[PDB]
């Protein structure tokens, strides 16, 4: 198969794994919950968001513990939770496209297949706080329990950028999805033209939205001595405006930690800030 | 070069040591075969982080090298001459003697298991890859060292160096050392990683550049310095990579001086420590503690020609921590011995406060209160009051602060507060200024700490604009809150109120009308329960008996007599803490009896009708509280006999706090 050199995760079996964990399921998990319903819970979902046009599938993703197969699935994703959901967003769309192509009557085949979707993996696991947060946790799922405080207005994102030097017309869009923008030193739209001025039109390329939050934990069950200190949030899609602050809360997120530049005109840096990047609230 | 770069030969060299950790191999057999060894393995099947490298290990190590007569140099002498370069040489000993592939695991059950050896395999087959950057040794360790000294009778067998010096005399030749330093931990930080090795990737070769960790500033460096990816018209941009960077931990603290070894003259000062391995998380604000760690100091980088001279601003680097003065688990036979003896109103009574003249009605009032339990659990919206709150008047010269207060420091989570400080609107919890990290945090006052349990309060005279506010919003229930421009969040509220306040000027005067020295009459009348008085009336027989009482704590030391045995105030706490997990429920008689109680309670009270002594119309929240106690009585005496005498237990109680003021 096809092995990354940065990860160690397998290619698309997981595809294949779902749709029988999927379409074959209809019930599972009573076996630990032994007490003693005929269909799955996302089986009609996933028909309700086809006709409600919805882009979010709020995946309680206990249930690969609960299925058969599916364990190194499941140990993968709380061990590489960034590739792993971007492979899933492949298939949800696919899957997607497998209930399309039966009736071909179904949103005129285009328009429910352009608008991308997203999964949200929550309730995974458990933790217990703050004091638990040893530095080898670094791309895993914690489940915290606190309290938010306050807020900021969004601040743009730079995931397109635009570019135009002094010819008569030039409107190239480079795309960055990195830390680094890359320029030209040549000119462009003719065949001679010296290495010109490159100008920066920023106000022409879109940007998404994105919100920073602050946390302080519940103080449960500290010992009377202990101050309930902070940590902070990062969100990307549309769960802004929804998460006020005043309220308990129960976040589902992974785990990331940036540099800071130590001299504020120097690029030099070390003790680190990190923070959490929610996929799904509650 | 030239001008005095070479130094005088000096007789100690490193070498002589160098080969004197190689016979550290297996040689001590002394301390099931070689012991230090033996801790070897139980760290590389990977489940603990943190050898021991004593000095026991070292002097009986030097014991049997009592007969090889042959030249041995000095371990502690050069170990307390410069510290820190006795773990460089001492981890380039261990690779050399370590056993590698001791414990099994498969795919997972390791952190960071399959992807190291991705990495080394990656760097393997690119060792001969041509038809080449060796390890620096810092990336596979996974491992730390540690160091503990001895102060015990081997110091006085035959020769020191941890002798519990304070911080006041220590700024001399102590630099560059191992010393420990007593203290009191104050300001601790959070854990944030730390960095001790690097990888940048630029996506051509994918050659990782390693590189050793400096002080806390740093740069990247180029593109164009590798051996595959550079050297041509294309060069991979080089960035950063995370999982490839193993972190470590970290966290500061500071300590001050004992106030006690203190001289007459100056404050005490502070000092800085950090920490590293595994010893983290394991220090709190307020333990009176030691450590014993290496001393180096560090540059300042910064503003270093105008300002900043030669100045050193060192620290401590922390090796060891000996932390000190910290239901039905092999504690069941002290809470027999109370099952056994009995003896619940009367030897639990002489056993909390047995420091006072008299006074046993007010100490009995008390232990029942320091059990509360869960007053019924009400499953529909209905949230009863709980934890009834009982307060105490009156100017005795018995110094009255410490008749309370010393139960507070005994009482369970019990929080001591007093009129300056944490007013009543530092009471709760607020936003306030902070150090250069996180500002704005929430710091906390006493009630949002110290929720169920004992808020024993004193100066009731003292910031009463802020004060009157806030004992109505712990006595109404649930809204201990911060109504401010923040936010509008509301946190719980159940906790137990003891209060004294303290008269007018010189004595109340019983002849004149009370509430002429407590200003809150809305706040007593209708919303406690229980008063009582500590009023000084002039009576012989007792007060020479009193003066036998505090004079004869003078001449001995001790105080105990009148046939009472001591009792340990853990065996009443685990009495409580089990009392506290029983919760009987009433039976019918009893409610038949405080229906014809309250009627006998409305008839009298409705007789007097005069602002002369009494208080209270019978209010039915006096007839609730007596449901209260009584049940917690009943807890706490829990033999199944929630009955007529046992709220005849309480009624007893009412009538002896009511009516103090008669004489």
Same mark, same amino acid.
């Given at each position: 198969?096809?092995?990354?050199?940065?990860?160690?995760?397998?290619?698309?079996?997981?595809?294949?794994?779902?749709?029988?964990?999927?379409?074959?399921?209809?019930?599972?998990?009573?076996?630990?919950?032994?007490?003693?319903?005929?269909?799955?819970?996302?089986?009609?979902?996933?028909?309700?968001?086809?006709?409600?046009?919805?882009?979010?599938?709020?995946?309680?993703?206990?249930?690969?513990?609960?299925?058969?197969?599916?364990?190194?699935?499941?140990?993968?994703?709380?061990?590489?939770?960034?590739?792993?959901?971007?492979?899933?967003?492949?298939?949800?769309?696919?899957?997607?496209?497998?209930?399309?192509?039966?009736?071909?009557?179904?949103?005129?085949?285009?328009?429910?297949?352009?608008?991308?979707?997203?999964?949200?993996?929550?309730?995974?696991?458990?933790?217990?706080?703050?004091?638990?947060?040893?530095?080898?946790?670094?791309?895993?799922?914690?489940?915290?329990?606190?309290?938010?405080?306050?807020?900021?207005?969004?601040?743009?994102?730079?995931?397109?950028?635009?570019?135009?030097?002094?010819?008569?017309?030039?409107?190239?869009?480079?795309?960055?999805?990195?830390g680094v923008i890359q320029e030209p030193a040549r000119c462009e739209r003719i065949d001679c033209n010296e290495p010109n001025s490159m100008s920066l039109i920023h106000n022409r390329c879109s940007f998404a939205?994105?919100?920073?939050?602050?946390?302080?934990?519940?103080?449960?069950?500290?010992?009377?001595?202990?101050?309930?200190?902070?940590?902070?949030?990062?969100?990307?899609?549309?769960?802004?405006?929804?998460?006020?602050?005043?309220?308990?809360?129960?976040?589902?997120?992974?785990?990331?930690?940036?540099?800071?530049?130590?001299?504020?005109?120097?690029?030099?840096?070390?003790?680190?800030?990190?923070?959490?990047?929610?996929?799904?609230?509650? | 070069? =030239?001008?005095?770069?070479?130094?005088?030969?000096? *007789?100690?060299?490193?070498?002589?040591?160098?080969?004197?950790?190689?016979?550290?191999?297996?040689?001590?057999?002394? &301390?099931?075969?070689?012991?230090?060894?033996?801790?070897?393995?139980?760290?590389?099947?990977?489940?603990?982080?943190?050898?021991?490298?004593?000095? &026991?290990?070292?002097?009986?190590?030097?014991?049997?090298?009592?007969?090889?007569?042959?030249?041995?140099?000095?371990?502690? =002498?050069?170990?307390?001459?410069?510290?820190?370069?006795?773990?460089?040489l001492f981890c380039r000993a261990i690779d050399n003697n370590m056993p590698l592939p001791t414990k099994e695991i498969d795919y997972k059950d390791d952190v960071l298991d399959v992807i190291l050896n991705q990495?080394?395999?990656?760097?393997?087959?690119?060792?001969? &890859?041509?038809?080449?950057?060796?390890?620096?040794?810092?990336?596979?360790?996974?491992?730390?060292?540690?160091?503990?000294?001895?102060?015990?009778?081997?110091?006085?067998?035959?020769?020191?160096?941890?002798?519990?010096?304070?911080?006041?005399?220590?700024?001399?030749?102590?630099?560059?050392?191992?010393?420990?330093?007593?203290?009191? #931990?104050?300001?601790?930080?959070?854990?944030?990683?730390?960095?001790?090795?690097?990888?940048?990737?630029?996506?051509?070769?994918?050659?990782?550049?390693?590189?050793?960790?400096?002080?806390?500033?740093?740069?990247?460096?180029?593109?164009?310095?590798? @051996? @595959?990816?550079?050297?041509?018209?294309?060069?991979?941009?080089?960035?950063?990579?995370?999982?490839?960077?193993?972190?470590?931990?970290?966290?500061?603290?500071?300590?001050? @001086?004992?106030?006690?070894?203190?001289?007459?003259?100056?404050? *005490?000062?502070?000092?800085?420590?950090?920490?590293?391995?595994?010893?983290?998380?394991?220090?709190?604000?307020?333990?009176?503690?030691?450590?014993?760690?290496?001393?180096?100091?560090?540059?300042?980088?910064?503003?270093?020609?105008?300002?900043?001279?030669?100045?050193?601003?060192?620290?401590?680097?922390?090796?060891?921590?000996?932390?000190?003065?910290?239901?039905?688990?092999?504690?069941?036979?002290?809470?027999?011995?109370?099952?056994?003896?009995?003896?619940?109103?009367?030897?639990?009574?002489?056993? +909390?406060? *047995?420091?006072?003249?008299?006074?046993?009605?007010?100490?009995?009032?008390?232990?029942?209160?320091?059990?509360?339990?869960?007053?019924?659990?009400?499953?529909?919206?209905?949230?009863?009051?709980?934890?009834?709150?009982?307060?105490?008047?009156?100017?005795?010269?018995?110094?009255?602060?410490?008749?309370?207060?010393?139960?507070?420091? #005994?009482?369970?989570?019990?929080?001591?507060?007093?009129?300056?400080?944490?007013?009543?609107?530092?009471?709760?919890?607020?936003?306030?200024?902070?150090?250069?990290?996180?500002?704005? +945090?929430?710091?906390?006052?006493?009630?949002?700490?110290?929720?169920?349990?004992?808020?024993?309060?004193?100066?009731?005279?003292?910031?009463?604009?802020?004060?009157?506010?806030?004992?109505?919003?712990?006595?109404?229930?649930?809204? +201990?809150?911060?109504?401010?421009?923040?936010?509008?969040?509301?946190?719980?509220?159940?906790?137990? #109120?003891?209060?004294?306040?303290?008269?007018?000027?010189?004595?109340?005067?019983?002849?004149?009308?009370?509430?002429?020295?407590?200003?809150?009459?809305?706040?007593?009348?209708?919303?406690?329960?229980?008063?009582?008085?500590?009023?000084?009336?002039?009576?012989?027989?007792? &007060?020479?008996?009193?003066?036998?009482?505090?004079?004869?704590?003078?001449?001995?030391?001790?105080?105990?007599?009148?046939?009472?045995?001591?009792?340990? *105030?853990?065996?009443?706490?685990?009495?409580?803490?089990?009392?506290?997990?029983?919760?009987?429920?009433?039976?019918?008689?009893?409610?038949?009896?405080?229906?014809?109680?309250?009627?006998?309670?409305?008839?009298?009270?409705?007789?007097?009708?005069? =602002?002369?002594? =009494?208080?209270?119309?019978?209010?039915?929240?006096?007839?609730?509280?007596?449901?209260?106690?009584?049940?917690?009585?009943?807890?706490?005496?829990?033999?199944?006999?929630?009955?007529?005498?046992?709220?005849?237990?309480?009624?007893?109680?009412?009538?002896?706090?009511?009516?103090?003021?008669?004489?």
């Amino acid at each position: 198969l096809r092995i990354i050199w940065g990860t160690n995760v397998s290619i698309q079996e997981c595809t294949t794994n779902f749709r029988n964990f999927l379409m074959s399921f209809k019930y599972k998990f009573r076996k630990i919950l032994d007490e003693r319903d005929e269909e799955l819970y996302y089986i009609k979902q996933l028909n309700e968001m086809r006709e409600l046009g919805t882009s979010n599938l709020n995946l309680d993703a206990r249930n690969l513990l609960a299925y058969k197969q599916t364990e190194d699935l499941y140990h993968q994703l709380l061990n590489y939770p960034q590739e792993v959901i971007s492979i899933m967003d492949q298939t949800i769309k696919d899957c997607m496209v497998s209930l399309i192509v039966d009736n071909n009557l179904d949103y005129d085949l285009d328009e429910i297949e352009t608008k991308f979707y997203k999964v949200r993996p929550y309730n995974v696991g458990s933790c217990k706080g703050m004091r638990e947060l040893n530095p080898n946790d670094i791309d895993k799922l914690i489940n915290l329990k606190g309290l938010v405080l306050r807020s900021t207005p969004v601040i743009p994102d730079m995931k397109v950028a635009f570019f135009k030097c002094n010819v008569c017309d030039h409107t190239m869009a480079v795309e960055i999805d990195r830390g680094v923008i890359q320029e030209p030193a040549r000119c462009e739209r003719i065949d001679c033209n010296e290495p010109n001025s490159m100008s920066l039109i920023h106000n022409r390329c879109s940007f998404a939205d994105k919100q920073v939050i602050k946390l302080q934990e519940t103080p449960d069950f500290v010992p009377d001595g202990q101050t309930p200190h902070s940590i902070s949030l990062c969100v990307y899609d549309e769960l802004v405006d929804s998460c006020r602050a005043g309220d308990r809360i129960e976040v589902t997120g992974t785990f990331r930690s940036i540099p800071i530049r130590a001299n504020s005109r120097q690029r030099v840096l070390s003790l680190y800030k990190t923070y959490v990047d929610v996929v799904h609230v509650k | 070069m =030239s001008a005095a770069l070479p130094s005088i030969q000096l *007789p100690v060299d490193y070498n002589n040591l160098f080969n004197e950790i190689t016979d550290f191999l297996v040689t001590f057999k002394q &301390d099931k075969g070689p012991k230090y060894m033996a801790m070897l393995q139980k760290v590389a099947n990977r489940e603990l982080n943190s050898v021991i490298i004593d000095l &026991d290990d070292i002097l009986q190590y030097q014991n049997e090298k009592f007969l090889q007569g042959t030249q041995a140099d000095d371990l502690v =002498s050069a170990i307390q001459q410069n510290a820190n370069h006795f773990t460089e040489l001492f981890c380039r000993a261990i690779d050399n003697n370590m056993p590698l592939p001791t414990k099994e695991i498969d795919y997972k059950d390791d952190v960071l298991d399959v992807i190291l050896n991705q990495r080394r395999l990656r760097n393997e087959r690119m060792l001969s &890859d041509r038809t080449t950057e060796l390890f620096p040794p810092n990336l596979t360790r996974r491992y730390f060292l540690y160091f503990k000294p001895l102060s015990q009778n081997c110091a006085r067998r035959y020769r020191i160096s941890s002798k519990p010096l304070s911080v006041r005399q220590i700024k001399g030749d102590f630099l560059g050392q191992l010393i420990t330093v007593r203290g009191i #931990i104050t300001r601790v930080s959070d854990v944030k990683p730390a960095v001790e090795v690097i990888a940048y990737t630029c996506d051509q070769c994918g050659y990782e550049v390693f590189q050793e960790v400096n002080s806390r500033t740093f740069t990247p460096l180029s593109e164009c310095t590798s @051996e @595959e990816c550079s050297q041509n018209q294309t060069k991979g941009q080089l960035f950063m990579s995370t999982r490839a960077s193993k972190f470590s931990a970290f966290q500061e603290c500071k300590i001050q @001086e004992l106030s006690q070894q203190v001289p007459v003259g100056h404050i *005490p000062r502070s000092l800085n420590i950090h920490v590293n391995g595994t010893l983290v998380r394991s220090l709190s604000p307020g333990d009176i503690v030691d450590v014993t760690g290496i001393f180096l100091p560090a540059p300042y980088t910064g503003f270093k020609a105008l300002k900043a001279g030669l100045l050193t601003e060192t620290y401590l680097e922390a090796q060891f921590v000996r932390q000190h003065k910290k239901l039905t688990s092999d504690v069941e036979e002290r809470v027999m011995e109370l099952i056994t003896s009995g003896d619940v109103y009367n030897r639990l009574a002489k056993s +909390i406060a *047995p420091e006072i003249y008299g006074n046993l009605d007010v100490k009995k009032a008390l232990l029942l209160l320091l059990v509360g339990g869960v007053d019924k659990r009400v499953g529909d919206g209905m949230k009863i009051r709980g934890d009834i709150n009982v307060c105490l008047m009156g100017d005795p010269g018995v110094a009255k602060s410490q008749l309370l207060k010393a139960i507070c420091k #005994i009482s369970p989570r019990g929080v001591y507060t007093t009129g300056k400080g944490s007013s009543g609107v530092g009471l709760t919890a607020a936003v306030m200024k902070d150090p250069v990290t996180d500002e704005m +945090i929430l710091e906390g006052g006493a009630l949002v700490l110290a929720d169920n349990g004992i808020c024993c309060i004193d100066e009731f005279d003292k910031m009463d604009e802020s004060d009157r506010t806030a004992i109505h919003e712990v006595m109404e229930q649930q809204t +201990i809150s911060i109504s401010k421009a923040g936010i509008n969040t509301t946190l719980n509220a159940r906790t137990s #109120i003891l209060a004294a306040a303290n008269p007018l000027y010189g004595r109340y005067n019983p002849r004149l009308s009370p509430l002429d020295n407590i200003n809150l009459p809305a706040a007593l009348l209708s919303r406690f329960d229980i008063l009582f008085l500590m009023l000084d009336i002039p009576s012989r027989d007792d &007060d020479e008996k009193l003066a036998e009482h505090v004079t004869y704590v003078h001449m001995h030391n001790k105080q105990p007599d009148l046939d009472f045995t001591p009792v340990e *105030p853990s065996k009443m706490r685990e009495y409580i803490a089990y009392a506290k997990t029983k919760r009987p429920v009433m039976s019918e008689a009893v409610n038949d009896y405080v229906v014809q109680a309250y009627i006998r309670l409305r008839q009298d009270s409705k007789r007097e009708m005069d =602002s002369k002594f =009494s208080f209270g119309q019978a209010t039915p929240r006096t007839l609730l509280g007596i449901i209260r106690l009584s049940q917690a009585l009943a807890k706490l005496r829990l033999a199944d006999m929630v009955d007529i005498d046992d709220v005849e237990e309480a009624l007893r109680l009412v009538r002896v706090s009511k009516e103090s003021l008669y004489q």
